[PDB]
Amino acid sequence: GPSFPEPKVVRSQGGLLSLKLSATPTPLAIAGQRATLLTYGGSFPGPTLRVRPRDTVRLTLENRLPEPTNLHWHGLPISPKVDDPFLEIPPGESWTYEFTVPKELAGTFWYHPHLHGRVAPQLFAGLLGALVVESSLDAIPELREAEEHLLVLKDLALQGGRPAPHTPMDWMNGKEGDLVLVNGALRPTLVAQKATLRLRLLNASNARYYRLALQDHPLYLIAADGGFLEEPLEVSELLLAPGERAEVLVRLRKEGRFLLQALPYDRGAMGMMDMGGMAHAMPQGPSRPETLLYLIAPKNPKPLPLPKALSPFPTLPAPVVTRRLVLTEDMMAARFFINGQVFDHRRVDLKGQAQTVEVWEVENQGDMDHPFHLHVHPFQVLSVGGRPFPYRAWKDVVNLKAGEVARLLVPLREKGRTVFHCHIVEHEDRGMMGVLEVG
Numbered sequence: 001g002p003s004f005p006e007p008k009v010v011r012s013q014g015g016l017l018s019l020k021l022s023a024t025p026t027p028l029a030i031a032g033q034r035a036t037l038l039t040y041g042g043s044f045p046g047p048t049l050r051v052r053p054r055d056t057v058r059l060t061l062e063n064r065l066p067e068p069t070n071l072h073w074h075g076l077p078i079s080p081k082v083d084d085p086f087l088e089i090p091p092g093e094s095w096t097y098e099f100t101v102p103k104e105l106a107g108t109f110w111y112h113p114h115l116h117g118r119v120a121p122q123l124f125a126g127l128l129g130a131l132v133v134e135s136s137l138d139a140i141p142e143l144r145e146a147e148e149h150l151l152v153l154k155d156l157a158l159q160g161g162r163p164a165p166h167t168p169m170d171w172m173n174g175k176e177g178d179l180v181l182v183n184g185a186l187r188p189t190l191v192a193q194k195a196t197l198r199l200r201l202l203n204a205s206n207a208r209y210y211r212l213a214l215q216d217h218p219l220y221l222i223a224a225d226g227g228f229l230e231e232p233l234e235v236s237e238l239l240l241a242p243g244e245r246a247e248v249l250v251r252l253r254k255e256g257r258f259l260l261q262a263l264p265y266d267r268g269a270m271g272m273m274d275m276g277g278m279a280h281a282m283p284q285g286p287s288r289p290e291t292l293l294y295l296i297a298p299k300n301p302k303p304l305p306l307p308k309a310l311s312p313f314p315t316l317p318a319p320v321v322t323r324r325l326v327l328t329e330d331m332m333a334a335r336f337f338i339n340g341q342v343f344d345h346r347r348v349d350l351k352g353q354a355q356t357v358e359v360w361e362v363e364n365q366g367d368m369d370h371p372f373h374l375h376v377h378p379f380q381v382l383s384v385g386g387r388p389f390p391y392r393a394w395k396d397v398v399n400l401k402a403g404e405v406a407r408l409l410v411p412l413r414e415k416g417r418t419v420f421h422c423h424i425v426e427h428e429d430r431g432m433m434g435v436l437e438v439g
């Protein structure tokens with residue numbers, strides 16, 4: 001097949017994407033070995049769904065797992081009666097998700113389980129896939145003529161031909177694997193045919209971070225989690241926390257081989273040490289560097305000019321309330337809290353008003369990085385750690401290092417009951433989640 005593996009794409013037809021997926025244990029070949037993973041549609045990653053604004057999506061999920069499951073349409077501003085974080089599909093049963101893609105929407109989104117207490121093992125085992133919303137902006141020459149690829153960044157560990165089980169330390173840290181894969185492949189080669197690449201990036205890992213850097217090249221950020229930036233932003237590296245997405249343009253500068261790497265990054269994961277009676281927690285330190293793929297540039301590359309503008313960011317109404325959400329940890333108990341509480345599906349934690357704007361101040365008072373995710377209502381990051389954000393774009397995950405405060409502008413869209421949580425999904429399963437009701 002093609003040198004660069006990417007998930008199979010399913011496109012809407014005549015305004016309708018109608019599809020049956022099964023969640024199923026699936027034998028397959030992965031990184032040169034045979035393993036049984038949990039997949040959607042028989043593949044790892046699951047199929048990429050590619051739609052346009054105002055399309056109808058009709059997705060029937062059949063549960064062929066031994067435990068209940070559901071779907072979270074991560075990043076999609078739709079109703080929480082569709083993107084329902086409390087729904088359980090029992091083993092053997094099916095459920096049809098039907099929604100209309102919002103008119104003002106573009107970017108890379110994804111789907112994965114969200115059944116509280118079971119997310120981390122199900123996602124680690126392989127249950128995830130991407131959803132791409134095409135834009136009329138994709139027709140401007142500087143994007144249309146680029147070579148486009150999706151990169152699903154997800155790691156894995158195998159034991160006895162199956163995903164490795166979670167240990168107690170995994171529930172504390174979030175589980176990372178030794179197989180650091182791109183689209184389920186081990187260090188694939190991308191032989192570029194054009195000098196400009198448009199790369200859609202998705203961190204679908206449980207807990208691993210990707211401090212992205214391409215050898216000898218900057219990256220040009222053109223989209224965040226849930227939409228385009230207003231104009232391209234040149235960066236020397238790009239950190240992608242669990243659940244985040246980004247789109248970048250790569251402008252290949254000369255012939256040759258360039259490594260795309262995940263550079264060392266210390267997210268605050270912990271180990272245990274005994275040095276003379278004391279048996280106490282100790283920082284794991286930064287991750288070891290990983291090569292994600294080999295990028296081969298074509299002959300005499302002459303990249304396209306960058307687009308001068310992308311999409312103007314909406315002017316938001318003035319906000320009507322400020323919220324403060326504080327994250328804390330009990331590492332040795334593997335318990336995680338928001339404003340001193342663990343998740344309770346019966347307890348509403350915040351009550352807001354549809355079509356108003358709120359300011360959310362999220363403060364990480366723990367020692368680990370925590371990537372904070374809000375369902376249903378995309379937000380604008382104003383600042384993190386007291387530093388103003390260098391662009392305007394819709395996001396739905398924001399990473400917080402130890403001590404940092406994020407100030408978010410949160411327009412409330414669809415009415416109903418939804419959730420916010422850490423997207424180190426082990427921390428969500430262990431309690432770091434709360435309930436927002438919009439009325």
Ligand SMILES: [Cu+2]
Binds near residue numbers: 072074112243
């Ligand atoms: Cu998610």
Ligand SMILES: [Cu+2]
Binds near residue numbers: 373
């Ligand atoms: Cu969620």
Ligand SMILES: [Cu+2]
Binds near residue numbers: 370371422427428432
């Ligand atoms: Cu967390």
